[PDB]
From Swiss-Prot, chain A:
It is found in: Cell membrane. It comes from the Bacteria. This transcription activator controls cholera toxin, pilus colonization factor and outer membrane protein expression in V.cholerae. It binds to the 5'-TTTTGAT-3' tandemly repeated DNA sequence in the cholera toxin promoter region. ToxS interacts with the C-terminal periplasmic domain of ToxR, stimulating its activity. It activates transcription at the promoters for tcpI and tcpA and this is presumably via ToxT. Residues 1-103 bind DNA. The gene is toxR. This is Cholera toxin transcriptional activator.
Amino acid sequence: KFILAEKFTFDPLSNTLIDKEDSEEIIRLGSNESRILWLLAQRPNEVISRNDLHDFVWREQGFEVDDSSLTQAISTLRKMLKDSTKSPQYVKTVPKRGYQLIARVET
Amino acid sequence: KFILAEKFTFDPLSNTLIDKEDSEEIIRLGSNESRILWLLAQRPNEVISRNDLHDFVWREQGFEVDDSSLTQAISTLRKMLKDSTKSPQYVKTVPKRGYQLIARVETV
DNA sequence: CTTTATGTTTTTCTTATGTAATACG
DNA sequence: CGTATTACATAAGAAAAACATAAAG
């Protein structure tokens, strides 16, 4: 289990995400997004290779999807988190390098 | 005679420029720059084409100089005014359209 | 005064990423 | 009804073009 921005609880091994605003409302996370978060967390405030994310999220079960699916899933994740395009508080895009987890991370 | 920023006094007809800082120091302007200033002044805050300048500042007495001369004259002129390129107090450059006189201008 | 040479800023052009919308298992 | 891909939209970067200035002639 993980703690993020001192505001969100996240149980990865169940793909589930909660907020101190809403003790009531867990949000489901599509396997993709959850894995994304899990990985960005294990290595916080580091930059993650676009491909690194791609590969950890898909093809262990084979899946040679297009590159765009990642970009979508990202946007999806910030639409769940309600992180503004810019200024981003939780997840910074690093152009041509990948994505970075800037939110502070508790455990 | 013209007055700029309530600071510089510009006599175009003797190419002289004087600062309220310096009642003493007369600054002499190479003809080119005085002419530029005269023009920019008579059409203040308007954008002057790069060619309008070129032509007015030369050619009636001939000259087929290149564009660089203009650019240089401007740098020169701003040096006379202690005008900092960015950010300017007197003379704006307007990419591909020319130069423009933002300053506050009076007449005598 | 012109021009030339070296430096800095702007604009144009190309690539990277973001969504909202349609297609799909 | 939750993913993929689709179609535009915006942001970032790169490259070409313009301008600024310090030196030479």
